[PDB]
């Protein structure tokens, strides 16, 4: 049926989003990462969901070892922490979630937050959406004896899209606004050799 | 005409008519920044007239949230038109309101656009912009007239 | 299902299942939202100026003398709680700050405190947010304003249509000189205070 | 009449007559010490007769539980009463039930305050304090009389 | 809406209130603790609710050790216990948990418990308000080999206020009553140059 | 209030205030040039505030067709206010619409002006005058305020 091609459909299947390795690290959420899922959202212009993350963290060679951690949220108007004895990381007005490493990974979705009605990926004007900011760090006072790295993913759910645009073909340059090579421009199609075949 | 998208909003301004070369790229205007909180539609109107021994076909389309990779009322000129000067292939152009301007059939073209925003009112926001890109290439006999001129007028509707 | 012995603090076995404790009574006066408490006036502090830390007690009122002469400007501020100047000191600015979005429109009341045989006339005018404080009496009669007269009334409140989370600015002028008959005291003291209207909303909960 | 928090309680006792000069800072009273189990209401009111020719604004408000950084009939005075000699800001005394002794206007203020505790029944307690606040200090001319006096009338209410 | 504004909302999101190093430790229970929410809690003078504490154990340095604990609660009229091996940690009628350290954190909840009908922030009068007070051990008769470092976490529920009093401004001396430096007093607000701008 | 010949015409804008001392002779205002096809009435308002010690007597009266023998917002002042320094005496401009702003007495004065031209619709004519004579001069004792301030409000009614 139709039903396989649906806008809801179209966004699921939660997958990598950023890896981080801790040999205190901030991490802000930005949709616009990796080309594969930039130029899918890229399609339309107003976009309105929420998200669901999961952190499943590990030491490299891949073995678990009996770690507790932490992982906070930073809401968008907030003061990001600067050390690993910061007031930021005692406050509660930003939730955070503690879980051992042997445990299974820790789930958590967070809502629509914007002051408007809607995501912009396009913004003509000049100054606006940020999602906010998670914040991981092992808990204690002394230094921890072992090397961590953790990957995140995320699932979009109940999805709304509104005008529709052109699709991309030009490779990106920055990770904030559109700038092409502008003296290679790669075309669209391949090419013949003679309009008869 | 042609409806933006199905949805009706709820004096005749013209600007200056530019030039249609047999080598000009395109034309772009921006709004509402081309008529000089807000909350208004519009409605957009391009006439091209010109002689029944010339050829050629303009695409018009509006574009909301039209950034570049402040014209004013004269306008801009494209660089490179086959990306739209903003990366997206001009080739695909028309999943947006359009219209033709084929110059052996009707030579005008009217869209209307209401209001797309994502707040319910608002003068540093433009809105959509409005493009005229040149197809098919113009070509002529020698003798006639080098240059085809193009009018624009804009007309706001329900604005508050 | 992943998410399982995580501590989620934003998110019970009871210790003591025999105890019943203390039934409540009726002590009067109680609050269901902080809406109610953003909805008093109180003193603003518009003579924050820097020689005044020493001693604290005359912030709360801004003068008026007859040495000032007519069509001058008296005493200038925004229209924002959430930032710091004169609207730290009140309850509402106090309360803004423990939250991060706020919308809605303000009240401003001003109080005359001078003697009862003196008369005279103030013009108050507020700008909307966008523009620039005016440089003339003349031009500031143009936008919204209020005059006041302390001759007869001695108080009146001003409305500020709306506020958002580039700000207004609101200003207090001299529409005749201050006239006094002999025997009474030559100066006189303002006192300004601020409240909310019934449509003021705080969205999202922050630490100050 | 203000009724504090808008609850009807369910002889006149007058007190010694504070002056007020030209550099005062203030006084406050406790209660029910100041007319020395117990549950009673109480009317509080306060009259400032002056001349016309004087100018001033006092501030009468009532504090539940008002803690200090057992004064009896006379009173006392404060020390810094921006910080209320309690840490709390004067500029939001206003919170509590209240009133203005605008000498330009009426110069009288009566208070209605109903039984506020914890337990249905209660000397050694004292309930609410009362503070008198000289917020626009008071000036006149030379050769007016120097001090204005200020009454203050207590009568209990509901009492058992 | 109105909802993000009310008494329940504003005393949520349980935030850490006290932290306890072992190299038996008592801990009682008190709210006018950590500066942020006595402030919160003074706005108003009689304040009626119920707690929900939480204890998140680990050695320093982050890692987890299989470890038997005891957390052991005391009512406001009961002996505190005095050494290692007393009759208090045996007598049965003030409530004890035990819980092993690789396990997630124990959740225990405390009654509104007192005499009068709220709790009282301010007292005019001469002697009240005691909540009860925990104890924290190592199950064992003889001494554990490694040192634990714990945080209590605790949240409010079903919170009722009374008669609103203006808030503070001057910075705090002591833990019990309100004394300020009465020679430096800070004012409110900040100060310009002039008052015409 | 009193109405200009008994006829109805069919913001607030506040003008500078004059100080009026003790040796002053007078002003007078020319409209429609103070605010600045025309066809509009006008709604006069003049308000004079003075201590109970102070006494005078004003004489606010509207002219039409006001000639001398273009001031603008600030006004004028007349040289010879015996004769309005127009050849007409004083003592007789009693005939046209007036006010008294006697100081023992109300302090205020308006005055409703119809449109009255010769032709149904009219920036270079100036259709009538607005005199304020202090034919009483003013008195005071050493000590108190010695400029009393006038205010002046006008109110176009009826324009088109």
Redesign the interface.
Same mark, same amino acid.
């Given at each position: 049926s139709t039903q396989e091609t649906a806008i809801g459909n179209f966004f699921s299947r939660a997958g990598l989003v950023s890896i981080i390795t801790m040999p205190y690290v901030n991490w802000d959420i930005d949709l616009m990462g990796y080309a594969q899922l930039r130029r899918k959202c890229e399609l339309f212009t107003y976009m309105r969901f929420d998200a669901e993350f999961t952190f499943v963290v590990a030491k490299p060679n891949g073995v678990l070892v009996p770690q507790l951690l932490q992982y906070m949220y930073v809401p968008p108007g907030a003061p990001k922490p600067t050390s690993r004895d910061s007031f930021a990381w005692q406050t509660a007005t930003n939730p955070s979630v503690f879980v051992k490493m042997t445990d299974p990974p820790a789930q958590v979705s967070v809502p629509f937050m914007s002051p408007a009605s809607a995501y912009q990926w396009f913004y003509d004007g000049y100054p606006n959406n940020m999602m906010g900011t998670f914040s991981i760090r092992t808990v204690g006072t002394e230094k921890s004896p072992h090397s961590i790295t953790l990957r995140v993913y995320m699932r979009i759910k109940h999805v709304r899209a509104w005008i529709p645009r052109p699709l991309r073909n030009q490779p990106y340059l920055f990770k904030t606004n559109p700038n092409y090579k502008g003296n290679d421009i790669k075309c669209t199609s391949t090419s013949r050799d003679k309009i008869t075949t | 005409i042609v409806i933006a998208?199905g949805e009706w909003p709820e004096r005749f301004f013209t600007l200056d008519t530019k030039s249609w070369a047999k080598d000009s790229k395109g034309w772009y205007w921006?709004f509402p920044d081309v008529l000089t909180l807000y909350r208004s539609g519009f409605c957009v109107h391009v006439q091209c007239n010109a002689s029944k021994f010339h050829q050629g076909a303009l695409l018009v389309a509006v574009?909301?949230?039209?950034?570049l %990779?402040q014209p004013g009322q004269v306008g801009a000129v494209l660089?490179?038109p086959?990306?739209?000067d903003? %990366?997206?292939?001009l080739?695909?152009?028309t999943?947006?309101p359009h219209q033709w301007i084929n110059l052996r059939t009707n030579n005008c073209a009217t869209i209307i656009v209401p209001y797309?925003n994502?707040?319910p009112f608002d003068l #540093?926001?433009? #809105?959509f912009g409005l493009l005229v890109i040149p197809v098919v290439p113009l070509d002529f006999n020698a003798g006639a007239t080098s240059e085809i001129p193009i009018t624009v007028t804009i007309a706001p509707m329900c604005a508050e | 299902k992943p998410g399982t012995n995580q501590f989620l603090t934003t998110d019970s076995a009871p210790i003591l299942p025999g105890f019943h404790p203390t039934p409540p009574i009726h002590i009067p006066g109680e609050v269901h939202n902080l809406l109610e408490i953003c909805r008093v006036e109180t003193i603003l502090e518009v003579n924050n100026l820097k020689t005044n830390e020493t001693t604290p007690m005359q912030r709360l009122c801004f003068p008026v003398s007859v040495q000032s002469k007519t069509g001058e400007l008296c005493a200038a501020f925004r229209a924002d709680p959430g930032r710091d100047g004169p609207w730290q000191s009140t309850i509402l600015g106090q309360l803004c700050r423990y939250y991060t979005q706020w919308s809605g429109s303000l009240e401003v009341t001003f109080m005359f405190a001078g003697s009862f045989m003196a008369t005279g006339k103030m013009l108050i005018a507020y700008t909307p947010p966008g523009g620039n404080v005016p440089a003339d009496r003349i031009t500031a009669m143009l936008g919204t304003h209020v005059i006041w007269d302390f001759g007869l009334q001695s108080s009146v409140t001003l409305v500020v249509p709306w506020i958002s989370n580039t700000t207004g600015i609101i200003t207090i002028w001299y529409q005749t000189n201050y006239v006094v008959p002999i025997g009474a005291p030559t100066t006189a003291y303002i006192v300004a205070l601020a409240a909310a209207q019934d449509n003021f909303t705080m969205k999202l909960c922050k630490d100050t």
């Open positions: - | 998208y921006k574009l909301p949230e039209y950034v %990779g660089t490179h086959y990306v739209l903003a %990366g997206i292939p080739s695909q152009l999943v947006c797309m994502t707040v #540093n926001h433009c #809105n | -």
